[PDB]
Amino acid sequence: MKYIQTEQQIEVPEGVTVSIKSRIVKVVGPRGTLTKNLKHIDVTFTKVNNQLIKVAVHNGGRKHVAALRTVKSLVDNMITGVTKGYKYKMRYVYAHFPINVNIVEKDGAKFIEVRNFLGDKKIRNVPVRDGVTIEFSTNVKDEIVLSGNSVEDVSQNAADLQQICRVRNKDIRKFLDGIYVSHKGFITEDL
Amino acid sequence: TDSIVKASNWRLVEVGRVVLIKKGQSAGKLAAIVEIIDQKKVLIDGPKAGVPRQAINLGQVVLTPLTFALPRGARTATVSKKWAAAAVCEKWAASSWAKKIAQRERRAALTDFERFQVMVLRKQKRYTVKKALAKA
Amino acid sequence: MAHFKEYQVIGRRLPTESVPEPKLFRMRIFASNEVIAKSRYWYFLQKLHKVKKASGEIVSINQINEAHPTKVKNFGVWVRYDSRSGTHNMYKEIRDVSRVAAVETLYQDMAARHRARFRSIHILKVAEIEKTADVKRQYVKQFLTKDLKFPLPHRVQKSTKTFSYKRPSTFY
Amino acid sequence: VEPVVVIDGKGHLVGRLASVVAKQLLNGQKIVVVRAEELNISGEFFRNKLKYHDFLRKATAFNKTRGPFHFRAPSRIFYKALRGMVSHKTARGKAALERLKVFEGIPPPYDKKKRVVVPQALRVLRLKPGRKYTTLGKLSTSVGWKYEDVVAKLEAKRKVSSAEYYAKKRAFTKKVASANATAAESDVAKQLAALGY
Amino acid sequence: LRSLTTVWAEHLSDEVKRRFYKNWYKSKKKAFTKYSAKYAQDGAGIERELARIKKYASVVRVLVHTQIRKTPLAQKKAHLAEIQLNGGSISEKVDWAREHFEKTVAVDSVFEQNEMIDAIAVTKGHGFEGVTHRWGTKKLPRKTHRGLRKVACIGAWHPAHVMWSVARAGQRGYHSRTSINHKIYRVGKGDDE
RNA sequence: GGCCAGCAUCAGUUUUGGUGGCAGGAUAAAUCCAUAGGAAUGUAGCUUGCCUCGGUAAGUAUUAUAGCCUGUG
RNA sequence: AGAACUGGCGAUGCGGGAUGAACCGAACGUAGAGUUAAGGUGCCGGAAUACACGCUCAUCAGACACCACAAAAGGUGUUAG
RNA sequence: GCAGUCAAGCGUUCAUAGCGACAUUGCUUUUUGAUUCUUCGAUGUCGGCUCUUCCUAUCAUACCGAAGCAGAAUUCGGUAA
RNA sequence: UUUGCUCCACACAAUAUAGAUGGAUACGAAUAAGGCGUCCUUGUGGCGUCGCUGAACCAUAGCAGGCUAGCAACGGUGCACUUGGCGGAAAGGCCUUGGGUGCUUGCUGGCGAAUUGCAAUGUCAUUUUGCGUGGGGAUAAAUCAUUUGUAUACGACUUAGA
Ligand SMILES: [Mg+2]
Ligand SMILES: [Mg+2]
Ligand SMILES: [Mg+2]
Ligand SMILES: [Mg+2]
Ligand SMILES: [Mg+2]
Ligand SMILES: [Mg+2]
Ligand SMILES: [Mg+2]
Ligand SMILES: [Mg+2]
Ligand SMILES: [Mg+2]
Ligand SMILES: [Mg+2]
Ligand SMILES: [Mg+2]
Ligand SMILES: [Mg+2]
Ligand SMILES: [Mg+2]
Ligand SMILES: [Mg+2]
Ligand SMILES: [Mg+2]
Ligand SMILES: [Mg+2]
Ligand SMILES: [Mg+2]
Ligand SMILES: [Mg+2]
Ligand SMILES: [Mg+2]
Ligand SMILES: [Mg+2]
Ligand SMILES: [Mg+2]
Ligand SMILES: [Mg+2]
Ligand SMILES: [Mg+2]
Ligand SMILES: [Mg+2]
Ligand SMILES: [Mg+2]
Ligand SMILES: [Mg+2]
Ligand SMILES: [Mg+2]
Ligand SMILES: [Mg+2]
Ligand SMILES: [Mg+2]
Ligand SMILES: [Mg+2]
Ligand SMILES: [Mg+2]
Ligand SMILES: [Mg+2]
Ligand SMILES: [Mg+2]
Ligand SMILES: [Mg+2]
Ligand SMILES: [Mg+2]
Ligand SMILES: [Mg+2]
Ligand SMILES: [Mg+2]
Ligand SMILES: [Mg+2]
Ligand SMILES: [Mg+2]
Ligand SMILES: [Mg+2]
Ligand SMILES: [Mg+2]
Ligand SMILES: [Mg+2]
Ligand SMILES: [Mg+2]
Ligand SMILES: [Mg+2]
Ligand SMILES: [Mg+2]
Ligand SMILES: [Mg+2]
Ligand SMILES: [Mg+2]
Ligand SMILES: [Mg+2]
Ligand SMILES: [Mg+2]
């Protein structure tokens, strides 16, 4: 029934300075900076003060309005990603063959290199994305940890690795083997 | 490092926004948006210009950056009082828009002779400017 | 069916020697002319009374102009309509400036949303909604909210020549 | 209006650009169309991708030579949309087509010549904002067109030169304005005002 | 891709010049005689052609020809042909080729031992051929009237046309082939028992 | 006066404009004026609570430092 | 495949339905000017890329009677009840 | 001939893993019928041989989801000619 | 083979024309955003301003535009020369230098125009070609036949021959 105006709020912290022309969004804070392109969406941004930004949609459909929030969402995560940052943890899972994970580099690469998945003589590889950084955890067994400013770039790099160890030709309820995302969070602690 | 969010600052449909009617008996006249009917229709009134109080489709009007104090749903007299009060007419008068419309109306009303003398003048201007444009 | 007028029609059953002065009934009838509106009158009457045009007479037909033609009003609207499968009662609310305007959009809205052609619709009641917050359907409440304003973003000028030399601007 | 009309294709709708081009031709108006690779088609990329493959499968069974021909290049796609709007087997038909010329990118003469637009085919004016659409270049490159990268390359290089040309012109028209301003307030200037100039 | 110049050596072996003719013996052999002039003037107009190549030119090929007289063949009339040049940089490429005008290039400078090369050549000819050997069609049975190196059904009724796919008697041989992966077991050397 | 035209005044047919006088109707309905009554998507003022010396908010408050609605004439 | 009443085709062109015996419109001497029917008016192609309100986005959308087919049953797609 | 909808049952238990009564909606035109429109001043029958191409309602091969999938084997489904 | 070819020049002659009749007047990019001006900290920056159509801009007066004088300017423009430079996407065009020369309706003058008879496109474009003249430049080949066999039904292919 075309909603005459619906808007959202994008809160801004004491560290960052988001800036937006056309619909190119630059969020810059303590942890670096990310930018993201919203042209595909038709919303209108409005500064109200260095801690508040409104985003709104005039005379819109359900599908339009529905994309309003996901823009508030997307831009939010740039702000938190540049303040706290993101840290996805995955823990290996195997009932006999010790999944063996390593980091390698051909032509200035950084690749997540997986060996012995269910024993596979095959050597699995997953590129490390730029933005994302990866510590094999001391003190926690078979834990891999991916971390960066972009939720979408760490989550995806996580999901690349988890998937590359899918199981074919077995009852995948009994063959639960894999590398699985085991915790999603922030980098800066206490929060 | 402040923040810098663009703007995109539209003219708005609102009580007391003046619009230039673009087709119809009225057309070329200004008038005021009184009440507001739906997303596509508004109630207008332009006493100072002759245009009858009426409903009209926004599509037939063009919004202008001009605005004044108008009680929502205020009747024709009230409309006229406020308007003259706000001096909207000479405001619009002084705008480029209106000065532009005025220009093409004059151009359009020229005698063949007047036209001929417009040329003699351009030749004349053209002479001393093309000169200017060559001494610095 | 067209652009409407609203008529009072008054018909009354040809008198009989034993019953002169029959009862006199009125209907407000929306139609684009009186030939139609009289026809509609007889339609509905034969749906209520023992009569047919044949045995009745019209006494008067009068057009009823909007009381306050340049005042904006929230209308409640009451329609019985026929669908492909069965028939249905319905309540719509229309905001415009005359009952005649409103009946014109209703008829469209019914055609558009429900594929109801004119034959298949009965207007049961059209009445002005006095106190707001008796306005029910939201697509109307939206337009009753204090100091209301809105932009018309993405402007489109109708070009009058086939070629333009600019490259346009949907600014506004 | 003019001996030749060069149309910058960028931001136009194939079938609407086609439709107006056809008529102009049939009325004697020579047309050249540029940047056909920046042309649009309503509808998501994929759709028109399938639409194209539909066209792909039709051929003369006994001899795929005599059968329908599948031109991949953006201009050639365009011609199809256009040619189909011309009784191209009349002589009158061939006649008109010949006043037409379509081009991916903007090659010499035309770059220095001015190009126009056709508002009633201009996507940004026609399509409901929100709807999905397609660029010719991506479509064509997806069905065999071999030359997207080169055109993009040559153009970026063209666009460099032209952006000089403009800055240079913009520079000159600042002076011209400056010259004009000193002539403001002259008798002759107030007079021309008085007559609408 | 389009060719935008050809710059030529000054002196041209008769062997190539022969390729530019259908009737050597009768002919006044005037080929390239004006072109060779372009060198006389300091260099002037050949430089700018080389120059031209360098400024533009996305690829560069060299025109080489064979020394058919060093070959038992009767055929006398050499084979001229363009070879793309893949070492570094456009500029160095035309520098290289300018250096090798008239100068002579060796096989061992293009192929090494055990290298995989491909061979591009026109197949041996056989002229008009029955459907049976041209397409490897089954022989028809012995009992058959009017011959049996044929194809019984040249097509179904509709589409009412013989089709491009079915086998027919035609030329066989004298075809171009690019066939690949031929390993070099010897790179021979003429001055060598 | 042979051929073919141009314009003027007319006639038949027709098409397309400008403009004048009238008749209906709720003797249009409205706007407008006057007058009575009213309300809120509540104007002034007043209260109260924060709030960078007032601006906001939420309360009263029916014309005040905006106005509107309804009937009657 | 077989009856009833009418209107038709057959015996009949002309405009429309791309096409077509029977549908729509309209029935024919030779012509001029006007107006229309059925049907149309982005381009093919004469004729508004007219006006107005909605609805609909389909990784096999839909697109005008006769007519050149689709059903039960489903959808937390969207719309109004 | 092939494919559905409802779900009483079947399947230790458990409607729908895999099946599915009573009903009921369809599709297909390699069944056979019904018709008799075209060919009776003639359109060469059955089958095989040969050879091409097309359809998909997929037997195999590629990649997938599901299982009353532990493994092996198999079954159901998808993208697929 | 009867002085043939080519480029520039003008001349006559033909032959045409899918349709001259002031000017195809060059950023790019975005459209829920931009152009321009200005400023600065040169940025997704500040400030001003514009759109709402090319209905514009430029050009436009003179026998289809004749013959002439002068002034004020030092500008504009046509032309052929000349300087330095840019353009390969189909560059085959663009820009800059310097003297020469024409015109200038920037302003002010002297003459001319009729009878083409009250309209009759009233002829001002550009295509290709042919033939002499003389201003530069240039002096081949292919085919048949003969011959090879890396080819071939015939043609064709591929060799060879002062
Ligand atoms: Mg499985
Ligand atoms: Mg298994
Ligand atoms: Mg009433
Ligand atoms: Mg060259
Ligand atoms: Mg043999
Ligand atoms: Mg064989
Ligand atoms: Mg063999
Ligand atoms: Mg065979
Ligand atoms: Mg026999
Ligand atoms: Mg005559
Ligand atoms: Mg008359
Ligand atoms: Mg009148
Ligand atoms: Mg007020
Ligand atoms: Mg009938
Ligand atoms: Mg008969
Ligand atoms: Mg008939
Ligand atoms: Mg017809
Ligand atoms: Mg049809
Ligand atoms: Mg057509
Ligand atoms: Mg037309
Ligand atoms: Mg029907
Ligand atoms: Mg249904
Ligand atoms: Mg539904
Ligand atoms: Mg049951
Ligand atoms: Mg169970
Ligand atoms: Mg049970
Ligand atoms: Mg069944
Ligand atoms: Mg069967
Ligand atoms: Mg039969
Ligand atoms: Mg027979
Ligand atoms: Mg026969
Ligand atoms: Mg026969
Ligand atoms: Mg036969
Ligand atoms: Mg097929
Ligand atoms: Mg299938
Ligand atoms: Mg179980
Ligand atoms: Mg699947
Ligand atoms: Mg196949
Ligand atoms: Mg296929
Ligand atoms: Mg012609
Ligand atoms: Mg601005
Ligand atoms: Mg600027
Ligand atoms: Mg700025
Ligand atoms: Mg301009
Ligand atoms: Mg002169
Ligand atoms: Mg004079
Ligand atoms: Mg060209
Ligand atoms: Mg000569
Ligand atoms: Mg032999």
Side-chain angles (χ1 to χ4, degrees), chain A, chain B, chain C, chain D, chain E residues 2-193:
Chain A
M1 60 144 250
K2 298 276 261 222
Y3 296 80
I4 169 171
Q5 111 81 27
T6 125
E7 96 201 2
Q8 293 294 341
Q9 253 143 40
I10 299 195
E11 189 204 346
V12 212
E14 295 327 74
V16 319
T17 54
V18 2
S19 356
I20 355 212
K21 183 135 95 158
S22 115
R23 270 142 318 173
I24 297 299
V25 189
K26 180 171 276 187
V27 187
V28 195
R31 197 163 275 275
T33 142
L34 324 142
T35 55
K36 171 190 268 345
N37 193 314
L38 291 172
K39 308 195 85 109
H40 71 109
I41 226 272
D42 282 309
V43 299
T44 283
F45 281 66
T46 302
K47 177 159 175 183
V48 10
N49 53 57
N50 285 270
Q51 298 79 27
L52 219 220
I53 302 190
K54 285 188 6 188
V55 297
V57 170
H58 303 106
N59 195 44
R62 229 187 168 259
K63 297 293 179 88
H64 199 199
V65 183
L68 207 217
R69 221 309 217 271
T70 128
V71 186
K72 179 203 143 75
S73 238
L74 287 195
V75 183
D76 267 333
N77 292 5
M78 293 190 298
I79 301 166
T80 60
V82 99
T83 42
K84 309 177 180 189
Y86 285 82
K87 177 180 275 229
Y88 275 63
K89 304 155 129 158
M90 312 172 55
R91 277 260 289 314
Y92 313 168
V93 161
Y94 56 105
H96 182 280
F97 294 108
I99 297 165
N100 179 3
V101 176
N102 240 2
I103 293 181
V104 308
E105 163 181 7
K106 170 163 222 84
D107 326 314
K110 282 249 233 194
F111 282 125
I112 304 178
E113 186 230 62
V114 190
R115 314 195 157 234
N116 197 48
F117 180 75
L118 271 145
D120 255 8
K121 239 50 174 86
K122 172 170 194 46
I123 321 204
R124 276 159 242 264
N125 302 280
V126 165
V128 181
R129 270 151 202 289
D130 304 74
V132 349
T133 109
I134 288 169
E135 330 138 68
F136 297 102
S137 298
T138 282
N139 103 258
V140 181
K141 155 130 160 281
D142 301 336
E143 193 162 65
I144 217 174
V145 180
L146 317 89
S147 51
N149 292 353
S150 165
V151 213
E152 22 192 65
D153 267 349
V154 157
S155 52
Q156 184 62 210
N157 207 131
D160 302 333
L161 224 194
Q162 123 124 30
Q163 273 212 311
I164 234 312
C165 320
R166 284 132 95 176
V167 189
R168 313 164 23 96
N169 296 290
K170 292 301 175 307
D171 183 336
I172 90 278
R173 329 130 132 183
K174 167 77 185 137
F175 289 67
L176 290 188
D177 281 69
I179 313 189
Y180 295 98
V181 168
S182 70
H183 178 269
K184 308 148 123 202
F186 309 134
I187 286 186
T188 81
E189 234 63 334
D190 155 282
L191 269 134
Chain B
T1 71
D2 300 319
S3 246
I4 314 305
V5 177
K6 250 208 90 73
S8 174
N9 164 76
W10 290 293
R11 327 202 185 111
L12 301 176
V13 346
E14 58 185 293
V15 187
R17 145 96 33 200
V18 350
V19 310
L20 191 56
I21 285 155
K22 70 177 174 261
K23 33 226 177 201
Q25 335 227 16
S26 297
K29 283 144 175 158
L30 300 174
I33 292 174
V34 187
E35 199 119 12
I36 169 176
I37 319 169
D38 55 41
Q39 251 282 341
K40 290 168 102 106
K41 281 179 268 305
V42 299
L43 165 69
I44 69 188
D45 216 353
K48 217 128 165 280
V51 24
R53 190 171 241 247
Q54 56 192 130
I56 208 204
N57 195 317
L58 269 158
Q60 298 193 56
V61 119
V62 316
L63 302 184
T64 91
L66 291 160
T67 58
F68 66 115
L70 216 295
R72 140 178 154 253
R75 317 174 57 134
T76 316
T78 311
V79 176
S80 209
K81 191 212 273 176
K82 289 278 177 206
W83 183 289
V88 5
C89 244
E90 56 275 56
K91 231 157 295 232
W92 162 260
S95 81
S96 174
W97 200 338
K99 285 186 195 178
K100 206 73 58 68
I101 302 181
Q103 208 201 43
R104 81 176 84 123
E105 282 189 355
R106 185 57 220 273
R107 286 208 207 187
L110 294 187
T111 274
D112 184 57
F113 191 29
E114 304 190 292
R115 232 178 294 120
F116 179 72
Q117 346 165 352
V118 178
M119 156 192 190
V120 191
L121 282 161
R122 283 170 100 252
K123 323 275 292 258
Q124 250 145 52
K125 187 181 173 194
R126 200 240 264 121
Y127 193 85
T128 71
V129 173
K130 288 218 118 46
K131 266 227 323 202
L133 204 204
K135 299 271 172 292
Chain C
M1 176 237 40
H3 164 67
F4 297 91
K5 299 203 174 76
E6 186 190 20
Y7 301 90
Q8 136 175 297
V9 196
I10 299 196
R12 75 117 185 236
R13 285 213 129 185
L14 301 177
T16 59
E17 160 237 313
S18 81
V19 190
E21 271 127 293
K23 229 207 275 197
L24 266 207
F25 301 82
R26 177 171 165 282
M27 285 204 66
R28 289 165 63 117
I29 291 287
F30 297 90
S32 66
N33 60 72
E34 334 191 352
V35 164
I36 298 162
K38 284 190 300 190
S39 188
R40 293 311 292 163
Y41 175 89
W42 282 125
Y43 172 66
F44 292 106
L45 245 275
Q46 305 178 12
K47 261 168 159 39
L48 306 179
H49 290 356
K50 257 313 166 55
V51 264
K52 51 197 182 128
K53 180 195 148 103
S55 48
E57 116 175 295
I58 277 75
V59 195
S60 186
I61 214 300
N62 303 81
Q63 184 180 327
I64 306 167
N65 309 324
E66 177 74 33
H68 296 299
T70 63
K71 169 228 208 166
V72 168
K73 315 161 218 215
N74 299 329
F75 296 95
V77 190
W78 280 266
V79 154
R80 173 204 245 222
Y81 95 98
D82 273 316
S83 71
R84 312 221 179 101
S85 344
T87 118
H88 320 288
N89 305 289
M90 243 187 201
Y91 172 71
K92 249 153 182 298
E93 299 191 334
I94 309 188
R95 182 165 154 107
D96 194 322
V97 76
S98 49
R99 303 158 51 86
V100 84
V103 149
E104 163 91 82
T105 93
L106 161 82
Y107 261 118
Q108 311 286 125
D109 179 81
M110 290 298 295
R113 293 188 140 98
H114 296 287
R115 281 33 226 234
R117 331 299 144 115
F118 186 96
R119 60 172 159 259
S120 267
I121 288 180
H122 292 9
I123 312 178
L124 294 188
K125 160 134 134 129
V126 167
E128 177 180 285
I129 305 183
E130 229 88 37
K131 300 182 306 179
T132 103
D134 284 288
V135 174
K136 304 252 133 54
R137 240 114 257 175
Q138 144 128 106
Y139 52 71
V140 182
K141 285 184 144 196
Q142 249 192 170
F143 292 107
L144 318 171
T145 120
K146 193 79 174 320
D147 298 335
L148 155 52
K149 12 226 231 173
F150 57 81
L152 314 175
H154 193 73
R155 178 114 138 291
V156 258
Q157 335 243 6
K158 169 187 72 85
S159 197
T160 29
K161 314 175 63 167
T162 91
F163 301 141
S164 203
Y165 288 99
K166 255 171 195 78
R167 186 123 253 160
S169 165
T170 47
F171 103 87
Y172 202 7
Chain D
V1 57
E2 295 171 345
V4 193
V5 175
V6 184
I7 314 190
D8 180 317
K10 168 166 186 313
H12 294 74
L13 296 184
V14 177
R16 273 168 203 271
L17 191 50
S19 182
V20 348
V21 170
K23 233 299 146 62
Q24 303 263 317
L25 289 189
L26 294 177
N27 293 333
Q29 189 35 88
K30 286 154 229 61
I31 259 93
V32 2
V33 183
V34 283
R35 322 214 257 168
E37 79 279 9
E38 289 268 44
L39 211 34
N40 305 139
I41 319 208
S42 44
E44 159 173 44
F45 166 91
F46 208 74
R47 280 191 76 68
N48 286 317
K49 205 214 193 318
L50 300 159
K51 271 177 177 169
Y52 193 98
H53 270 268
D54 276 356
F55 165 86
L56 230 15
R57 66 200 299 265
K58 311 171 154 20
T60 292
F62 47 89
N63 186 334
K64 268 90 180 174
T65 288
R66 22 228 313 174
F69 298 107
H70 314 92
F71 289 91
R72 319 299 222 262
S75 43
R76 246 47 262 318
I77 267 181
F78 191 21
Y79 197 79
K80 196 240 204 193
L82 234 146
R83 188 238 231 181
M85 296 170 184
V86 170
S87 168
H88 77 278
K89 291 175 176 161
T90 56
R92 156 119 178 295
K94 305 206 203 97
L97 276 179
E98 278 221 79
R99 328 182 155 104
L100 182 52
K101 294 224 270 301
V102 192
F103 280 121
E104 31 275 358
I106 304 161
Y110 306 94
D111 38 9
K112 319 263 228 305
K113 268 54 184 169
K114 127 153 276 190
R115 31 238 175 247
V116 311
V117 286
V118 188
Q120 44 146 241
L122 230 41
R123 202 207 74 239
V124 45
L125 302 185
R126 255 263 138 192
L127 229 64
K128 179 132 113 59
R131 299 286 188 215
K132 258 108 138 47
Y133 59 90
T134 300
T135 331
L136 224 33
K138 299 314 191 163
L139 187 56
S140 290
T141 241
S142 124
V143 301
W145 173 39
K146 314 228 210 103
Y147 304 95
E148 165 161 8
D149 290 4
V150 163
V151 166
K153 177 201 201 83
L154 281 163
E155 274 273 279
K157 171 213 217 175
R158 176 204 132 236
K159 292 206 227 292
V160 162
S161 283
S162 190
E164 256 138 21
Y165 157 78
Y166 180 97
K168 203 201 146 294
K169 164 196 278 202
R170 189 173 58 188
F172 172 64
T173 165
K174 199 200 297 184
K175 296 173 61 184
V176 170
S178 151
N180 215 317
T182 224
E185 226 50 52
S186 66
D187 284 344
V188 28
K190 318 251 299 164
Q191 284 173 279
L192 284 128
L195 306 180
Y197 292 78
Chain E
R2 143 165 126 78
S3 76
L4 101 120
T5 345
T6 329
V7 198
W8 286 90
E10 174 165 348
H11 306 269
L12 237 48
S13 163
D14 256 31
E15 269 167 308
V16 240
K17 268 150 159 288
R18 176 107 52 159
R19 154 72 38 198
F20 298 120
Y21 282 136
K22 307 322 221 65
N23 308 285
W24 192 244
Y25 79 114
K26 296 195 324 151
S27 70
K28 307 311 214 68
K29 325 271 185 40
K30 306 287 303 311
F32 281 104
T33 56
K34 298 198 163 49
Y35 191 85
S36 253
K38 296 168 120 286
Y39 282 94
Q41 20 118 296
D42 53 280
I46 275 163
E47 297 278 69
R48 226 55 231 142
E49 287 330 300
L50 268 356
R52 156 88 43 56
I53 288 191
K54 304 196 159 166
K55 208 195 190 166
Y56 308 102
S58 236
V59 326
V60 182
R61 314 186 162 154
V62 153
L63 289 145
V64 320
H65 81 76
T66 74
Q67 267 162 89
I68 207 154
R69 73 193 151 76
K70 279 176 152 69
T71 262
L73 289 171
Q75 137 109 7
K76 249 176 192 177
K77 179 197 207 172
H79 285 89
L80 161 77
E82 296 176 14
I83 297 181
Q84 166 151 298
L85 225 45
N86 265 7
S89 156
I90 10 75
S91 172
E92 318 179 285
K93 275 161 216 290
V94 25
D95 272 352
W96 194 99
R98 170 53 238 239
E99 286 172 353
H100 295 80
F101 279 5
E102 238 335 288
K103 244 92 186 188
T104 212
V105 163
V107 207
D108 59 342
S109 101
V110 174
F111 298 134
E112 8 177 331
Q113 257 263 0
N114 2 259
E115 208 209 294
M116 304 294 283
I117 63 183
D118 333 300
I120 305 167
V122 182
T123 284
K124 199 217 282 163
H126 290 105
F128 211 101
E129 184 80 291
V131 76
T132 286
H133 203 240
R134 177 146 123 116
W135 283 105
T137 250
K138 179 115 268 159
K139 280 183 81 196
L140 273 356
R142 173 204 72 108
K143 232 137 139 259
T144 81
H145 198 23
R146 10 163 159 280
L148 50 79
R149 327 193 94 230
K150 311 187 91 202
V151 163
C153 191
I154 244 55
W157 182 328
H158 300 67
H161 299 110
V162 183
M163 291 198 134
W164 74 286
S165 33
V166 6
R168 320 234 64 205
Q171 165 88 9
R172 149 168 108 100
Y174 210 70
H175 303 307
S176 334
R177 303 285 114 131
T178 293
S179 104
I180 62 163
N181 283 337
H182 301 286
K183 198 186 261 304
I184 305 200
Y185 285 5
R186 195 76 142 198
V187 168
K189 282 205 82 59
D191 45 326
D192 183 43
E193 281 297 336

